Amino acid sequence: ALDKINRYAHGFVAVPVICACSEAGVFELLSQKKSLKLEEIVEHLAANSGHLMVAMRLLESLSFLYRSQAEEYILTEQSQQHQIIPKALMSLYKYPFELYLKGEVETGISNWINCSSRRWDTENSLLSDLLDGVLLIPLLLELKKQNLLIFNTLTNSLKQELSTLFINLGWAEEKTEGLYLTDIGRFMRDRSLNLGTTASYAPMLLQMKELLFGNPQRVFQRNKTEKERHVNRTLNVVASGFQHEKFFADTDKIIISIFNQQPIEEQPIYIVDMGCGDGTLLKRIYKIIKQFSARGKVLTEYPIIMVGVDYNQEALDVTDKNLVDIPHLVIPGDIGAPEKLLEQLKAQGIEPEKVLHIRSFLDHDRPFIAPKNTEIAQARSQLDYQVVDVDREGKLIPPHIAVQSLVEHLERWSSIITRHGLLLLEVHSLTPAVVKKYIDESESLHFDAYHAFSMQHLVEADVFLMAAAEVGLFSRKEAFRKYPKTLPLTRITVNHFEKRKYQIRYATVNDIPNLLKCATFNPPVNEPFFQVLLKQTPTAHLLLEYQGELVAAIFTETKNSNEVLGIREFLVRTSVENWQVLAKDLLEFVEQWGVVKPGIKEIEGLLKYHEAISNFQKSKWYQS
Ligand SMILES: C[S@@+](CC[C@H](N)C(=O)[O-])C[C@H]1O[C@@H](n2cnc3c(N)ncnc32)[C@H](O)[C@@H]1O
Ligand SMILES: [Mn+2]
C-alpha cells in the first residue's frame, strides 16, 4: 500500500529519462550494436556524459539494461517497455492542474484517466504505477493545495472525472449516499508532502532532453533576479524541511548525553548550525537541553548560545525570528568555508574551543570544489567507487575525483572541530545493484537521480564514513543511527563525529610490503593472497595510520550474493604506542562501516577477532 507512493515518485523521474532516451534512439543504438561503453554512446548521440551516466544508472536500476565485465551496456527484454509509454505523456509536466481544477482550461485529462483505468495497457504492475505517478503526483498536490480533500464543489463534469479516477484507484468509494475517501485515499492525502520534494524538480525533469543531449546550462542558468529555474525552490524548501525534520528527534539522545556530561563548565557554550535555514533544529536542540539535560537546570549560571549560520540573508532573518526568547546569534557563512566561519566567530569574541558544530543534510549540496591533492587523487583512481557526479558542462566527474573532493572538504572541517565534535546528519545514494534489489522499499531510484541531475554530490554511506575517517573524524558508536533501520542499505546517517589523532583509510596494493611485516592473528599472509583480496574487493580492507605509521589493518571477504561481510585477517604493529586500543577502535569502525555498506545483511567474525585482540598474548599471534 505504501509502495504505491514510492512508485509514483519513481515514475516522476524515470518517465522523462525513458522517453528522452527513446526519442534520441538510445534503445535503437544499443540494438544495432549490442555492447557500447558509456563514452561510445556519448560520442554517437552527442550526449552529455554526466547526465547520461545518471540516466543509464536509472535504467540499470529498473532492469532495462546491465553492464558487462568490460562495462558495456546491454539491453534486457524489459527495455522494450519504452514502447508502451505514450510519448505525449510528457505534456503533463506542463499541464495547468490549477486551472483544470476550477475549470478554466480548454482540454481536460480524460485520456489519462482512461489510460490509468486500463492500467496503461500493460500487466506490468510496476510500470503501470510509474506511468500513474506522472499524472497523480501533480493532481494530488493541487487537490491538496486547494483543500479539495468531497467533489460536490466542482462542476458535474469535473466531479465525474475525478470520481471515476478515485474509484478506480481505490481512493474513494460511494456505497450508500455520497462519496467518501477510503483508507488508501485518506493516506495519499495525508502523505502528499513527501512527494513535494520530487515534484519540485518538474521544470528540470521536463527538460531531460536538454540535460542528456543538449546544453544543460539552459536548464540551470539563473536570471538577474537570481531565481533558480530548474526547481521550484520555495515548494522544495517546505517539502524537504518537512522530511528532514523527521530525523531531528534522533539528535535528542545525543544532545542529552552531551549536556548531561559532568562537569557543566566543561560542556559547550555555543551550538553552531551551518545552513540553519529556518532554525528548526537549533530551536529543538535548545528546548531539549532545557527540559531533559542537567545543563538545562542551570542555564542562569551557564548560558547556552545558539548560532545560526547561512549564506542566505532571508534565512538568517527567519531564523532570528524563530529563535525569539532563545539567546542566539545569526551570521553569514558557507558550508564550504569553515575557516571563514572560525574567523567570524573569533571576531565576535567567541571562544572556538567552546563550540559544538552541527548541521543537517548540507554536505552533499555544497558548491563543488575540485581536488587540490592531485597525487592522492591518482592513488584513489584504482578503487572501484560508484559515485555519480555531474559538472556544470554536464560532463561526468570521475568517481575518485568526486570522492577526493569530499575528503578535502571534510579535511577543512576537521581542522576546526573541537573536543565537542560535529553533529552531522546526511543523506546518501545507493549502488544500482542494491537499488534494483530494493526498488519498492526505497526512495533511491528517484532521489539519487534528481540529486545527480541537479549537480548535487551524494555518495554512498560507507564512502562518506570513509572520507571522514581519512581526516580523523569518527562517528561515535553511542550517537550513531542509520535509516532504513532494517534493510541492507543506508540512505540517512545521524552522526556525532569526534576528532581523533589517527586516520583510517582503505588498504591498497602499495601497503602490502608494510602489511607483510605486521603481527597477524592468522599465519603470515603472503603477497598473492593479499593481491587476491585487494583485487576482488578494492574498497573493503581498512587500515589505521598514525603520524604516517601503520598501526593495524583488517581485511575482509564479501560473499553470498554480496550479502555477507566477514572479517578475514587482523594485523597489528605492537611497537606503536596504544596499538591495542587503536586496533580495537579499528574493529569497531569495521563493524560500523559494514553496517552501512550497500547490500550487506550481516557481518561474520566479530566475536572471533574481538577475542583475538582483547586477549592478545593468550591468542598467540604470529610475528609478534
Ligand atoms: C540545505 S536546505 C536546509 C538545510 C537544513 N540544515 C535542513 O536540515 O533542512 C537549504 C538551507 O541551507 C542553506 N544553504 C544552501 N547552501 C548553502 C551553503 N553552501 N552554505 C551555507 N548554507 C547553505 C540555504 O540558504 C537554506 O537556508
Ligand atoms: Mn539535496
Domain-wise residue ranges, the chain: 3-213, 239-368+403-428+459-501, 504-614
Q: What CA–CA distance (Å, rounded) separates 267 from 261?
A: 7
Instruction: Say if 239-368+403-428+459-501 and 504-614 have the same CATH topology.
Output: no
User: Nearest C-alpha to atom 13 of ligand 1 is from which residue?
Assistant: 275
Q: What CA–CA distance (Å, rounded) separates 490 from 580?
A: 30
Q: What is the DSSP letter of 622?
A: B
Q: What CA–CA distance (Å, rounded) separates 346 from 162?
A: 60
Phi, psi at residue 422, to the nearest 5°?
-140, 110
Closest C-alpha to 17, from 76, 60, 71, 68: 60
Residue 367 preceded by cis peptide, ω within 30? no
User: Nearest C-alpha to atom 20 of ligand 1 is from which residue?
Assistant: 334
Q: What CA–CA distance (Å, rounded) separates 117 from 220?
A: 37
How many CA atoms, within 13 angstroms, populate the side-chain half-sphere of residue 83? 6
Q: What CA–CA distance (Å, rounded) separates 65 from 74?
A: 5
**Residue 370 near residue 405, CB atoms below 8 Å:** yes
**Residue 55 near residue 21, CB atoms below 8 Å:** yes
Sign of CA dihedral 507, 513, 518, 524: positive
Return all residues near 229 (Cβ < 8 A) that are at least 6 apart: 203, 219, 220, 221, 222, 223
How many CA atoms, within 13 angstroms, populate the side-chain half-sphere of residue 478? 8
Sign of CA dihedral 96, 97, 98, 101: positive
User: Nearest C-alpha to atom 14 of ligand 1 is from which residue?
Assistant: 275
Return all residues near 239 (Cβ < 8 A) that are at least 6 apart: 193, 194, 195, 196, 197, 199, 200
β-pair partners for 558:
565
Q: What CA–CA distance (Å, rounded) separates 474 from 611?
A: 23
Breaks in the chain after (C-N > 2.5 angstroms)? 149
User: What's the CA-to-centroid distance between 88 and ligand 2, angstroms?
Assistant: 30
* Binding-site sequence positions for S-adenosyl-L-methionine: 244, 310-311, 334-335, 360
What are the helix (H) ranges across 432-503?
A: 432-437, 444-453, 461-470
Closest C-alpha to 325, from 391, 279, 277: 279
β-pair partners for 492:
427, 483
User: Nearest C-alpha to atom 26 of ligand 1 is from which residue?
Assistant: 277
Q: What is the DSSP letter of 226?
A: -
**What burial class does residue 132 get, using C-beta atoms within 10 Å of its C-beta: 0-12 exposed, 13-18 middle, 19+ buried?**
buried
Q: What CA–CA distance (Å, rounded) separates 465 from 459?
A: 10
Instruction: Give the three cell numbers for residue 443.
Output: 526512495
Helix (H) or strand (E) run with residue 65 in it: strand 65-67
Q: What angle do CA 345, 350, 354 make, to 5 degrees?
A: 110
**What burial class does residue 461 get, using C-beta atoms within 10 Å of its C-beta: 0-12 exposed, 13-18 middle, 19+ buried?**
buried
Q: What CA–CA distance (Å, rounded) separates 436 from 448?
A: 13
Q: What CA–CA distance (Å, rounded) separates 430 from 444?
A: 7
Q: What CA–CA distance (Å, rounded) separates 598 from 448?
A: 14
Closest C-alpha to 270, from 281, 284, 286, 257: 286
Phi, psi at residue 70, to the nearest 5°?
-85, 10
Q: What CA–CA distance (Å, rounded) separates 127 from 120?
A: 8
User: What's the CA-to-centroid distance between 308 and ligand 1, angstroms?
Assistant: 11
Q: What CA–CA distance (Å, rounded) separates 197 from 427?
A: 14
In one letter, which amino acid is 525? V
Ligand of minimum distance to the alpha carbon of 361 = 1
**Residue 488 near residue 601, CB atoms below 8 Å:** yes
Instruction: Give the three cell numbers for residue 332.
Output: 553569514
**Residue 298 near residue 264, CB atoms below 8 Å:** yes
Atom of ligand 1 nearest to the CA of 361: 8
Q: What CA–CA distance (Å, rounded) separates 267 from 265?
A: 6
In one letter, which amino acid is 423? L
Q: What CA–CA distance (Å, rounded) separates 148 from 166?
A: 13
Closest C-alpha to 136, from 199, 197, 230, 85: 199
β strands within 257-320, DSSP E:
270-274, 305-310
β strands within 476-522, DSSP E:
481-483, 492-499, 503-506, 519-520
Closest C-alpha to 130, from 213, 8, 229: 8
**Beta 542-546 vs 602-604: how paired, if at all?**
unpaired
Residue 189, classed as helix, strand or coil, is helix
CB atoms under 10 Å from CB of 99, counted, come to 12
**Residue 112 near residue 164, CB atoms below 8 Å:** no
Instruction: Give the three cell numbers for residue 343.
Output: 574567523
β-pair partners for 331:
309
CB atoms under 10 Å from CB of 505, counted, come to 19
**Residue 426 near residue 492, CB atoms below 8 Å:** yes
**Residue 410 near residue 373, CB atoms below 8 Å:** no
Q: Is the CB of 277 under 6 A from ligand 1?
A: yes
Pick 239-368+403-428+459-501's CATH classification: 3.40.190.10, 3.30.70.380, 3.40.50.150, 3.40.50.300: 3.40.50.150
Instruction: Give the three cell numbers for residue 448.
Output: 539519487
Instruction: Give the three cell numbers for residue 103.
Output: 475549470
Return all residues near 175 (Cβ < 8 A) that are at least 6 apart: none
Return all residues near 21 (Cβ < 8 A) that are at least 6 apart: 27, 55, 59, 82, 212
β strands within 204-295, DSSP E:
270-274
In one letter, which amino acid is 144? K
User: What's the CA-to-centroid distance between 99 and ligand 1, angstroms?
Assistant: 33
Distances (CA, A) of 127 to 4, 84, 443: 11, 9, 16
Atom of ligand 1 nearest to the CA of 365: 16
* Binding-site sequence positions: 244, 310-311, 334-335, 360, 364, 451, 456
Residue positions counted in the chain: 624
Residue 358, classed as helix, strand or coil, is strand
Distances (CA, A) of 292 to 297, 420, 528: 9, 19, 56
Residue 484 preceded by cis peptide, ω within 30? yes
Atom of ligand 1 nearest to the CA of 275: 22
Say which residue the cell 575528503 belongs to. Answer: 407
**Residue 62 near residue 445, CB atoms below 8 Å:** yes
Atom of ligand 1 nearest to the CA of 248: 8
Q: Is the CB of 293 under 6 A from ligand 1?
A: no
Distances (CA, A) of 557 to 213, 501, 533, 562: 41, 28, 7, 9
Residue 72, classed as helix, strand or coil, is coil
**Residue 565 near residue 540, CB atoms below 8 Å:** yes
Return all residues near 515 (Cβ < 8 A) that are at least 6 apart: 507, 525, 530, 543, 550, 553, 571
CATH code of the domain occupying 504-614? 3.40.630.30
Q: Is the CB of 441 under 6 A from ligand 1?
A: no
User: What's the CA-to-centroid distance between 597 and ligand 2, angstroms?
Assistant: 21
DSSP count for the chain of H helices, then E strands: 27, 20
3-state DSSP helix/strand/coil percent for the chain, to nearest 5?
A: 50, 15, 35
Q: What is the DSSP letter of 265?
A: G
User: What's the CA-to-centroid distance between 428 and ligand 2, angstroms?
Assistant: 10
- Angle at which helices 110-117 and 125-145 pack, to 10 degrees? 140
Q: What CA–CA distance (Å, rounded) separates 16 from 202?
A: 10
User: What's the CA-to-centroid distance between 1 and ligand 1, angstroms?
Assistant: 33
**What burial class does residue 431 get, using C-beta atoms within 10 Å of its C-beta: 0-12 exposed, 13-18 middle, 19+ buried?**
buried
Closest C-alpha to 277, from 239, 303, 222: 239
Atom of ligand 1 nearest to the CA of 240: 9
**Residue 151 near residue 98, CB atoms below 8 Å:** no
Region for 388 from its dihedrals, namely left if φ exceeds 0, alpha if ψ lies in -120 to 50, beta otherwise: beta
**Residue 423 near residue 496, CB atoms below 8 Å:** yes
Q: What CA–CA distance (Å, rounded) separates 600 from 230?
A: 36
Return all residues near 8 (Cβ < 8 A) that are at least 6 apart: 129, 130, 132, 133, 136, 137, 195
CA 508 to chain centre: 27
- Angle at which helices 156-168 and 110-117 pack, to 10 degrees? 20
Q: What CA–CA distance (Å, rounded) separates 475 from 486?
A: 20
- For 12-44, the DSSP string reads HHHHHHHHHHHHHTHHHHHHHSS-B-HHHHHHH
Longest dimension (CA), the chain: 86
Q: What CA–CA distance (Å, rounded) separates 258 from 526?
A: 46
Q: What is the DSSP letter of 279?
A: S
Say which residue the cell 577502535 belongs to. Answer: 585
**Beta 305-310 vs 328-332: how paired, if at all?**
parallel
Phi, psi at residue 492, to the nearest 5°?
-135, 135
User: Nearest C-alpha to atom 1 of ligand 1 is from which residue?
Assistant: 362
Say which residue the cell 513527501 belongs to. Answer: 194
